[PDB]
Amino acid sequence: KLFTPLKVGAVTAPNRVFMAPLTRLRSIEPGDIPTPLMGEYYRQRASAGLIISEATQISAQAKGYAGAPGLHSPEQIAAWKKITAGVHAEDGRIAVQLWHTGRISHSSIQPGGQAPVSASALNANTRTSLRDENGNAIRVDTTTPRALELDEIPGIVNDFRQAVANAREAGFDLVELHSAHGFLLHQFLSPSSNQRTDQYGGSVENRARLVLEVVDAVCNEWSADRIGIRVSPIGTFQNVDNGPNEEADALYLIEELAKRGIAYLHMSETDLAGGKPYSEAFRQKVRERFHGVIIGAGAYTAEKAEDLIGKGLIDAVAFGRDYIANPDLVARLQKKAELNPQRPESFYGGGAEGYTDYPSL
């Protein structure tokens, strides 16, 4: 089933082998600008059923990693237009993953060198990636954030809205809202990171309020059939857990998302460091609550993907690290060919080495 077509909102994927969003931290600074090298990397992978881009800033404030691209400035829009054109030239499809990093950030890459923002004022207690004086990636402890004031929340929603407008102009086929992995939207969703006492904290309805305002805004800006969302609602991701009622809270959020008739739900099932597997019962509960495409991700194999697609529980699989190392992953999985070995040391930062130099068959 992996090599059969699938309608995904406004487009049709020719296969179910998707490229997961993968931060590679190779953009130009100053300007957080996509490059021709990034264009080549995505063009090499255009046989994917769908490419989901690396996480991309909705605004300058959204930045948390040196080398991550934006989709807020004219120069960024112009550069992304070239990238999507290259993918389209090879008959591919590409979604842009849009984030605000919130508290997973550092003051040195924030506007004015000031503290980053979040739901509440507590430190992420993790690291982000900056660049040193020679442009090489380095890991640095996160800066303590300040809590967004209530009157700043509409501006966040507007920044997502505007970034989706920009994505449409840049020629993306779809957008993926980054509501996972401990970034801003997840910081609001999670009780561990959200201690607010206004209408954006406390109950699950309040904790989900921001992400649902964002979904509504971007559906209105473009169209619901252009919108996907990535969630990581079971387990702990970058120190952000999903709280004591994670299953019930996940199902609440998914039911709300379904009301908007969006294109897809992308579930990041496990952190890279591992987590409890999804039960089939939970998968069935998700499936009956959402009426668009469901994408599974997190250490999948082709075998696991075929099993779950055949069981009618998911529609597609996003592969991350296998896509880093195998531009023609689709052809390799179809032919049962060996994969190129991964070189994790060059996942983040640097240049062509470990990026565009993994060969196709």
299: annotated binding-site residue? yes
Q: Are 161 and 217 in contact (CB under 8 A)?
A: yes
Composition of the chain by helix, strand, coil, percent to 5: 35, 20, 45
Candidate list 16, 63, 181, 332; residue touching ligand FMN; CB under 6 A: 181
Instruction: Give the span between the Cα atoms of 157 and 274, in whole angstroms.
Output: 32
Whichever of 106 and 230 has its CB closer to ligand FMN, that residue is 230
CB of 228 to ligand FMN, least distance (A): 11
Candidate list 13, 17, 22, 66; residue touching ligand FMN; CB under 6 A: 22
CB of 51 to ligand FMN, least distance (A): 12
Instruction: Give the span between the Cα atoms of 268 and 84, in whole angstroms.
Output: 24
Whichever of 325 and 331 has its CB closer to ligand FMN, that residue is 325
Q: Is 347 in the site for ligand FMN (CB under 6 A)?
A: yes
Looking from the CA of 10 toward its CB, the CA atoms found within 13 Å total 16
Instruction: Give the span between the Cα atoms of 181 and 241, in whole angstroms.
Output: 9
Q: Which two tokens stand for residue 174?
A: 């779809």
Candidate list 321, 325, 346, 350; residue touching ligand FMN; CB under 6 A: 321
Residues from 213 through 242 that contact ligand FMN (CB under 6 A): 230
149: Cβ contacts below 8 Å, ≥ 6 apart: none
CB of 239 to ligand FMN, least distance (A): 16
320: annotated binding-site residue? yes
Looking from the CA of 149 toward its CB, the CA atoms found within 13 Å total 2
Q: Is 97 in the site for ligand FMN (CB under 6 A)?
A: yes
Q: Is 67 in the site for ligand FMN (CB under 6 A)?
A: no
Closest CA to 331 of 294, 295, 359: 359
CA distances from 263 to 15, 215, 259 (A): 16, 11, 12
Binding site for FMN: residue ranges? 21, 23, 55, 97, 181, 230, 299, 320-321
Binding site: residue ranges? 21, 23, 55, 97, 139, 178, 181, 230, 299, 320-321
Binding region for ligand FMN (CB under 6 A)? 20-23, 54-55, 97, 178, 180-181, 230, 268, 297-300, 319-322, 347
